[PDB]
Design brief:
The structure is a homohexamer.
Chain A: E1 2-4, E2 10-12, H1 17-30, H2 36-43, H3 49-57, H4 63-83, H5 101-104, H6 111-118, H7 126-144, H8 161-174, H9 179-190, H10 196-205, H11 211-217
Antiparallel strand pairs in A: 1-2
Helix pairs in contact in A: 1-2, 4-7
Bound molecules: ligand 61F (6 copies) and chloride ion (30 copies).
């Protein structure tokens, strides 16, 4: 990663063995459950493109998902090149060359160049741009590897309402979209798919009931 | 988090893999027992709103509780907005814009803006404000996920007094001061078994818990 | 905790996850054996009142003991207030308000105030004062949760003297008092409660025998 | 390794016990799976040739692979010597002698000489040059220890398409761009089972892997 | 402990949770085997008397041994007092009072006084003086808890010579130089079995242990 | 160990508990397999003679090997004294006394003296000299505790060539000597002791075949 030293300088630091192992283990244990995305974002805090590639490369298995990840990265790289065409010319002593999409992804850039972009004034955060592309691709994988659809989450006749809401929002979380779309699913399905006993109790509470109030009434 | 380096400067630091792992494991092992709140508060020491969102996001399962958490955060965010009406105008070179409720919660603010507020002079501690909202919401979850009421904790006829007081105060802690002193000293005696109850009335009012527990050991 | 940086300044540091976990685990594994007190004192090295409350709050179970701990803290807090009545008046720019008993215990003081007291010149060590109260209460719990009394430690007819002395001082350690009282128990009971074979051997050694000499003679 | 301290100076640091243990364990658990190469590259971040030799030396077993590694290193060392003919002469007070192939590999150079080259201005990065040779040799071992050829990866008649693509690209990664794109998009379809193959021809050319995998889920 | 920071200053540092845990575990697993002494000495590197008391206090069980340890410490403390008679008088602004035996042992001295002695110029190393007393007492415990005498270590008629020498020197280490050389070279041969003994007399005096072990492999 | 601080000064640092435990564990798990030597060298990076003695002393068991280690150290210490006779005379304010062999081994020198030698300008690296002697003795133990001789490594009639080469170089590695002697064993035995099918294939490849080429042809 790029961390701050004691002189106000942003300097490169080696990725720690604990960080490497933590990322490998979370993929091993959780596959592509939704909580793997925050794990990846935090473990790649301040990462260079090289560090991001290191983390993705150390993943064992799930190579179909990782290949989909590469395709998403290339799409974002192609879009970046269309939005930032490079301007030919000799690079000045101080400055650094403009980064292409393949430079952000770390395929055509060295670590020294990645450090130069990230520690520049103002910084060009190729690590955060690359991380955005990876997380975009990881969100697609979480979508695809989700076993259940939100329309199939129905409360059982003897299932506690808390367990039903657990399944509802677990399923809703794996279908990543805007909150306007997640609030729409809730207002469309959560009460309507509760079991008959709890459904009649919640409709009397009215639409203005909080989840806390809904869960309290169906205890 | 935002911590002091070895030379007195407030700088941003990445949340450590040990901190992330510790928080994930304690929720996995303890769910929403009362001791999860101090663990969260300590593990989020110096956290930015982004760190707090990271920690809450790494929680697997318990999405009903975590959704209740979002609603509590939105309630506190709305109250913050009502108490701090925004003043329109261009931001001066040095200062930073005043934060809204969604900025404290980290949904409409960048990490750099959060660092700017927290390292400002004087600091706007958006991380501690957000953490206050989260702990408020986590406390609601603990109280709701408490299975037993203090009125149902009664000492068995052959149950050691120590084990009964363990269960009593464990339950009282989950049933989240004016009433916690109310349960103590009078509900505790009333729900003791007849054998220990008779010993405790002889002690008279003003007995410490140590004196109460010593008198009912045998 | 409050640690020293590289400029001679005492600054606040976050309690580490390793420290939190270590304290939780030692309570889980050892309950209130006597060695939990040194574990707590070392793990709370340099702790603020907030850190001390964090450690006590993270304890799962043993809530009867922890409630006795609160009562001991309130007694010491009440005594501190009786010995240090606060003097009303506006606090000067540099100085800090005088700490009440509830401020030392962290119930009416902020972390910022605790840092101010502990890093003041001269420091008011509210963390060490609070720690004294907690350890006082923890010593009472170790006393109460000790299963055996020193008068019941008697050497068996075939029990090795070393195992008997192990039980003797293990029991004596859980009854915390002054060493004058622990030397009294030893001079009153250790030889007198050895089995007949070793007892007759030790009485011939005389009162001036060291424990090493006593254990060597009864091997 | 040679890392920057908290004040901008390039100083030598001892390889940590965690780094040593991590490298030993990953070889123990993963042998020469493709993901062992990124692990080695990251764990040897900033390494001197001595650190690289330490890491390779701590490997227990697999001495046939490790001997192949030595031969690859010697081949690259010989090429370095042919491209950098040595210039005889006394070394000036300030500078350092030019490194031979065996100096980069750490067999004829001391740790102090390696520090001198790596911290020179401009630096002679003997650690990264050596690491390049090692990873080149490790890549040869991975390819040789790959059990299956990409031509033998065919989807079973009842095998889920996801599992088939997992095996396909796992195998393709061990079979170490002009031909890796060649297997993709046409070998992948050709080795699918008749049921999914018929769906994939209807998608037409230009289908992404996401579109291919979505179409053969059921 | 009292360690140097990253800038040359001797400052107090809290004993780490890893150091505490390591010491507790080694006593739990190894009791008072001889290798417990080096572990204690290394784990107490730079320790104050308070740290040393902390480490000894965290030991669970073995209270007979730990009481023998206290008596040894008191013996050394009394000898220190006899060798350093106290000089009455008011302490000057700069200096520190001379330490008694109980001050070195940490029973009558505060942590701040211990820091003052250890960071003084010249330093009064109360931590290393105390540690010397503790290791002296720990050595007495190891010797007392050694089950076997060197005279009872004899090679079996079919026991490999290597295993016999392992047991011989393991026992000799617990039986805590003038006599340790005495057991070596002549007791070692005398307690070998007749088969290896006959080989070792043919080697003649002056044989190294390597030569002795090589000659009795088969 | 002796590490560099932030002022360019080489200062003493305590040996870490992780380093102590790692060395103890590797001896417990690997005994005296050849890879224990690199483990020891890396874990003793920058070690003082005191640290080296600490690591050797913490070894449980294998006391015959450790005694052979002491004898090797004394031989090297005696040779050092013969090559560096000490010159009597008062030590100047700045300088330090010349180290004897027993000073390098840490038996007659204090930690303060070891720090003085190692941080001197120019440094007298007693830690690296001692480490050389220990590794010399450790190499002798790996030799002696090797169960197999290189002449007994013969490929089985159905044994894969890769497994045979694994055994060959594992055995060759435990007999530590110069590479000229290890290249001699390879050119004398590796092809000659392959099974008849692979042996005839390799002899046709000729002596100029690499190991990669030899292993590919006998797959
Ligand atoms: C970098 C990473 C790790 C990230 C992130 C991130 C950023 C902001 C927020 C967030 C914070 C507070 C509030 Cl108040 C809202 C809100 N308020 S609102 C209009 O009412 O919805 N929106 N959002 C999310 C949106 F970005 F829009 F600002 C809020 C979050 C929250 C944090 C959180 C998690 C938690 F567990 C409980 C909380 F209290 C807060 N995380 C999510 O909300 C993810 N989530 N998704 C669903 C879904 F899909 F099931 F509905 C559910 C959840 C959480 C649990 C209930 C259901 N994270 S990242 C991603 O890049 O890797
Ligand atoms: C930030 C977090 C981590 C926090 C906190 C915090 C702050 C102050 C105190 C505290 C300290 C000392 C005393 Cl004297 C009182 C007291 N004195 S009083 C009139 O009698 O009430 N009050 N309180 C708490 C109140 F806020 F009120 F000021 C006291 C605490 C205490 C610390 C503690 C824990 C412990 F284990 C044993 C102790 F000795 C001290 N923690 C609690 O007391 C929690 N607790 N609750 C109940 C209940 F509800 F069952 F009674 C019980 C307990 C503990 C076990 C017995 C029963 N923590 S956090 C979480 O916000 O994230
Ligand atoms: C401080 C410690 C840890 C050390 C060391 C050290 C120093 C240099 C080298 C080294 C580096 C690169 C090349 Cl090119 C050669 C070479 N080139 S050459 C003429 O063709 O032979 N020689 N040597 C070794 C010699 F010192 F001479 F410079 C080379 C080494 C190598 C590192 C290595 C290990 C590995 F696993 C694979 C590699 F690619 C490189 N380690 C060894 O070679 C040990 N080894 N021994 C035998 C034997 F005995 F079976 F043949 C075998 C091996 C390695 C595996 C195959 C067989 N380490 S230490 C010791 O003090 O604790
Ligand atoms: C130093 C070490 C650790 C390294 C490295 C490294 C460098 C660059 C890239 C990389 C990044 C993004 C893209 Cl877009 C491309 C691309 N775009 S392209 C035209 O389609 O090929 N190429 N490459 C790699 C090439 F060098 F070519 F530039 C890309 C990588 C990627 C990182 C990665 C891994 C992942 F898991 C998922 C990702 F999204 C990105 N790693 C690989 O791709 C390895 N890999 N190989 C194959 C193969 F062979 F089976 F196809 C497959 C994979 C990954 C899983 C699918 C199949 N690492 S190292 C080791 O040297 O020590
Ligand atoms: C902060 C914490 C962790 C503390 C402490 C502390 C302070 C001083 C001493 C201490 C040091 C050396 C000597 Cl010479 C004496 C002595 N000399 S004397 C008159 O002859 O008795 N007194 N004391 C104790 C007294 F404070 F008075 F100065 C001595 C201690 C000792 C350390 C120790 C432990 C050990 F294991 C073996 C040792 F060699 C030394 N610890 C104890 O002694 C506790 N202990 N108690 C009993 C009892 F009850 F069974 F007798 C026994 C023991 C130890 C084992 C034998 C029996 N710790 S804390 C608490 O706040 O958490
Ligand atoms: C502070 C602590 C941790 C210590 C220490 C320490 C100091 C010096 C030495 C040492 C170093 C090298 C040599 Cl050459 C001699 C030697 N040369 S000589 C005439 O032959 O005796 N003497 N001694 C030790 C004596 F103090 F005497 F100067 C030597 C040691 C050695 C280190 C060591 C350990 C090892 F495992 C193998 C080695 F190569 C070197 N440790 C011992 O030797 C302990 N030991 N004891 C016996 C006994 F008793 F059974 F013979 C045996 C052993 C080791 C295994 C064989 C038998 N440690 S501490 C604890 O105080 O807390
Ligand atoms: Cl690490
Ligand atoms: Cl890269
Ligand atoms: Cl989830
Ligand atoms: Cl509920
Ligand atoms: Cl820092
Ligand atoms: Cl970490
Ligand atoms: Cl971790
Ligand atoms: Cl955020
Ligand atoms: Cl509880
Ligand atoms: Cl009780
Ligand atoms: Cl930590
Ligand atoms: Cl507090
Ligand atoms: Cl005990
Ligand atoms: Cl005994
Ligand atoms: Cl540093
Ligand atoms: Cl480490
Ligand atoms: Cl480790
Ligand atoms: Cl080397
Ligand atoms: Cl793979
Ligand atoms: Cl799929
Ligand atoms: Cl420091
Ligand atoms: Cl630690
Ligand atoms: Cl720990
Ligand atoms: Cl003390
Ligand atoms: Cl031993
Ligand atoms: Cl042998
Ligand atoms: Cl450590
Ligand atoms: Cl030493
Ligand atoms: Cl090997
Ligand atoms: Cl092969």
């Amino acid at each position: 990663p790029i961390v701050q030293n004691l002189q106000g300088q942003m300097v490169h630091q080696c990725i720690s063995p604990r960080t490497l192992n933590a990322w490998v283990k979370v993929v091993e244990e959780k596959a592509f459950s939704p909580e793997v995305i925050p794990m990846f974002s935090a473990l790649s805090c301040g990462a260079t493109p090289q560090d991001l590639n290191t983390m993705l490369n150390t993943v064992g298995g799930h190579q179909a998902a990782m290949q989909m990840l590469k395709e998403t990265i290339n799409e974002e790289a192609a879009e970046w090149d269309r939005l930032h065409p490079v301007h030919a010319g000799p690079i000045a002593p101080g400055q650094m060359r403009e980064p292409r999409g393949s430079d952000i992804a770390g395929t055509t850039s060295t670590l020294q160049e990645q450090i130069g972009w990230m520690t520049h004034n103002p910084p060009i955060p190729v690590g955060e741009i690359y991380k955005r592309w990876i997380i975009l691709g990881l969100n697609k994988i979480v979508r695809m590897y989700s076993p259940t659809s939100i329309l199939d989450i129905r409360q059982g006749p003897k299932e506690p309402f808390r367990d039903y809401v657990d399944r509802f929002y677990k399923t809703l979380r794996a279908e990543q979209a805007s909150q306007e779309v997640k609030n729409a699913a809730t207002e469309t399905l959560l009460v309507q798919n509760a079991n008959p006993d709890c459904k009649t109790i919640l409709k009397a509470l009215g639409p203005g009931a909080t989840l806390e109030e809904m869960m309290t009434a169906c205890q």
